[PDB]
């Protein structure tokens, strides 16, 4: 790849050199390797979470009696796990021969935690078998160990899919980079009240912006629109997971 | 490009290998070749199609007496063909010498059809000379032959522009990949009723999300904002094509 | 990178070869070099500029008595300059060793001007020290010299950040390419009246679409959501710059 020409930045004013943590450099290398290896498309969608939000907030009591804080992430994890089982091409990697897909029969999902030293993505194993408060506890633990440098490399491995949630900071949508060898990543942004047509008038519904980046060698455009559509459907009524 | 490190996926659970159809592998190679060769920008816009939709629906009679189903795609094709003639840089390819553009004086447009074996993009020739019901019949035929493996390689060649419509499945917008050597591709997503300011109050207008990816070596940001703006203008009143 | 197979475009109809200006070829090379070197993510946001717009329009008198036209660009420049100082990682470049960031202690910002011969990005030096009408005059001058080929290469150098505004043509959002060695670029699209929930009803507020592309080796997803969030905050009340 043609390199970027060096510039003497000090010709234009005062500069200062700060160094990169090894964690940032590892991260830098991994993203650029994904970038050049995966042809990326982002599919955007927004889900109606008015009812999900009401549930979240009502179970604040239960969650606190169990010591966890029920946020939107355990709900996101549960729903993507159900869906990764319904649409198995999202739960696979491209074989090194380029001629086969390795479909995984397990569902472990990573989630982005941004710490001082860099971004870490802890992995929760067998998300499909854990409950909303179990996933809530685990997420919280892994996030804390990630911030406190106590996260052993074991827990950063063998994920099938990544969720990256920035809803707690802001933004309308973003285009995340697929953490290869996984084949998709779900970006989640800030929810806001939007007017939604009820067939007769605009009702305010709470809308969650979803941004699915995927590896289009493996997942074609229609399979991906169907994944964010099913996800939007499941988050609008999470009871559909029960059937 | 640095390769992706191989992972033993079976350390984390049960895996299964399914293979790729040759069609998927061809597709995979073409997309990655486009990805590394074309610096991509997506320009998003949404067009007001309330009136277009009313027309579509009124001519259901005519369309059925002629045996075709008038969908939004013949209308999209007709309008982009008019525009590919008004803005000829969108109807060209970059010469192999990198120092010239080959401007095409013809308008053939491909459209994405997603079949079981992979994605196919049949090409309708001289879209600029065919009528709405002609284009409707042709699209329908090519889509059927594409699904039934009866599409001869002849019909996959020499397109000037691609339309990729996922509006029938869902989504708010996506970032399509330019099928090089073409220089742009129009992604179309699901139409929904949106509140639009009439200078005094919000009126519900039916809005179609447009996502124009382009090769920014050939098309600069302003030329592309002007293309989706003219397209939004033409779809809001398709009679402008008549003049 | 695998090359794109040559096609005989004249098999499908009449073609014509127009050549590229050296300016376009320079531009083409720079964008493709950025594309392959920088892993890109776009963060989207929209800012409430109802009040900013009212101010702009009230100071039409002052602006005209000073000979400049106060547009949204001097306001964008002032606010990003304040922010490039608050969040210094946005005002830096990656060292050639890949292991350090060169943080710049100066703020010069470039802005995209699209001319007949290609795109130029003049640089305004020390934007942080100039006032709204100063920046207004300077922008206008540089834009004119850029269109009239009288822009000396000196003024295209040593920028820290780029603003690319297409709001005057149209569009909902786009994904700009980072002009490496800079680490971010702000795309600005067309403002429109949107319904925004006041906690009780939807109020029409004038909304400006912001599209921040960044180099995710240097800037992680959360730092970027926080930059467009602070920017949206500053444009909703530009008096916050005063404190």
Expt. technique: X-ray
Number of domains in chain A: 1
Sequence-separated (6 or more) residues with CB below 8 Å from residue B59: B70
Rounded Cα distance, A216 and A223, in Å: 10
The torsion of the CA quartet C103, C188, A174, A151, rounded to 10 degrees, works out to 20
C17 → closest Cβ in B37, B102, B157: B102
Rounded Cα distance, B76 and B188, in Å: 9
Helices B221-236 and B50-58, interaxial angle, to 10°? 50
Q: Taking CB atoms and an 8 Å limit, are A170 and C229 in contact across chains?
A: yes
Query: Do the Cβ atoms of A164 and A189 come closer than 8 Å?
Result: no
CB-defined contacts A:B, below 8 A? 135
User: Judged by CB atoms within 8 Å, which residues 140-199 of B form the interface with C?
Assistant: 157-158, 175, 180-181, 195, 197
Q: Taking CB atoms and an 8 Å limit, are A226 and B176 in contact across chains?
A: no
Extract the tokens encoding B71: 């969908």
C19 → closest Cβ in B99, B223, B229: B99
Count other C-beta atoms under 10 Å from residue A204's C-beta: 16
Count other C-beta atoms under 10 Å from residue A124's C-beta: 23
User: Judged by CB atoms within 8 Å, which residues 201-230 of A form the interface with C?
Assistant: 202, 204
Reduced to 3 states (helix: H, G, I; strand: E, B; else coil), residue B243 is: coil
Query: Do the Cβ atoms of C225 and A169 come closer than 8 Å?
Result: yes
Query: Do the Cβ atoms of C49 and C206 come closer than 8 Å?
Result: yes
Query: Do the Cβ atoms of C200 and C207 come closer than 8 Å?
Result: no
- Strand pairing category for B100-104 and A184-188: unpaired
Alpha carbon of A26 to those of A31, A87, A109, A111, A177: distances in Å?
9, 31, 20, 17, 15
**B8 touching A, CB under 8 A?**
no
Q: Taking CB atoms and an 8 Å limit, are B1 and A36 in contact across chains?
A: yes
**C34 touching B, CB under 8 A?**
yes
For residue B190, the Cα-to-chain-centroid distance in whole angstroms is 13
Nearest CA in chain B to C174: B43
> C81 vs chain A: nearest CA distance in angstroms?
15
Rounded Cα distance, A239 and A134, in Å: 18
Nearest 5°: CA angle at B48, between B138 and B89? 60
Q: Compute chain B's Rg from CA coordinates.
A: 20
| Residues in chain B closer than 8 A to C20 (CB atoms) | 98-101
Q: Taking CB atoms and an 8 Å limit, are B176 and A43 in contact across chains?
A: no
The domain that holds B14 is classified in CATH as 3.30.559.10
Rounded Cα distance, B186 and C170, in Å: 16
Sequence-separated (6 or more) residues with CB below 8 Å from residue A8: none
Range of the domain at B40: 1-243
Rounded Cα distance, C145 and C154, in Å: 13
Query: Do the Cβ atoms of B68 and B140 come closer than 8 Å?
Result: yes
Q: b/e per residue, A1-38, with b = 16+ CB within 10 A? A: eeebeeeebeebeebeeeebeeebbebbebbbbbbbbb
> C20 vs chain A: nearest CA distance in angstroms?
21
Q: Taking CB atoms and an 8 Å limit, are A7 and C158 in contact across chains?
A: yes
User: Judged by CB atoms within 8 Å, which residues 89-118 of A form the interface with C?
Assistant: 112, 114, 118
Alpha carbon of A16 to those of A25, A241, C102, C203: distances in Å?
19, 54, 6, 46
Query: Do the Cβ atoms of C45 and C228 come closer than 8 Å?
Result: yes
Number of Cα atoms under 13 Å in the Cβ half of residue B10: 4
Sequence-separated (6 or more) residues with CB below 8 Å from residue C151: C120, C122, C142, C145
Query: Do the Cβ atoms of A212 and A178 come closer than 8 Å?
Result: no
Rounded Cα distance, C142 and C155, in Å: 8
Rounded Cα distance, C81 and C230, in Å: 12
Query: Do the Cβ atoms of B110 and B181 come closer than 8 Å?
Result: no
Q: b/e per residue, C11-38, with b = 16+ CB within 10 A? A: ebeebeeeebeeebbebbebbbbbbbbb
| Residues in chain C closer than 8 A to B229 (CB atoms) | 169-171
Extract the tokens encoding B107: 């308008």
Rounded Cα distance, B43 and B221, in Å: 8
C195 → closest Cβ in B98, B158, B202: B202
């Amino acid at each position: 790849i043609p390199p970027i020409p060096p510039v003497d930045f000090a010709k234009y004013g005062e500069i200062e050199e700060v160094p990169m943590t090894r964690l940032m450099q590892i991260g830098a290398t991994n993203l650029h390797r994904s970038w050049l290896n995966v042809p990326h498309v982002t599919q955007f969608e927004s889900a109606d979470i008015t009812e999900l939000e009401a549930f979240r907030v009502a179970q604040k009591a239960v969650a606190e009696k169990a010591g966890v804080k029920l946020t939107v992430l355990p709900l996101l994890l549960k729903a993507c796990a159900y869906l990764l089982k319904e649409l198995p091409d999202f739960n696979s990697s491209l074989a090194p021969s380029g001629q086969a897909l390795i479909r995984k029969k397990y569902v472990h999902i990573g989630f982005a935690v941004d710490t001082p030293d860099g971004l870490l993505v802890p992995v929760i194993r067998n998300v499909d078998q854990k409950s909303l408060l179990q996933l809530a506890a685990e997420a919280a633990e892994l996030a804390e160990k990630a911030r406190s440098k106590k996260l052993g490399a074991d827990a950063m491995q063998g994920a099938c899919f990544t969720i990256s949630s920035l809803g707690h900071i802001g933004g309308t949508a973003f285009t995340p980079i697929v953490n290869a060898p996984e084949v998709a990543i779900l970006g989640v942004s800030k929810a806001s009240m939007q007017p939604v047509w009820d067939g007769k008038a605009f009702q305010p519904r709470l809308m969650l912006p979803l941004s699915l980046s995927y590896d289009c060698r493996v997942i074609n455009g229609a399979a991906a629109a169907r994944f964010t559509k099913r996800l939007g459907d499941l988050l609008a009524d999470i009871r559909a997971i029960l059937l």
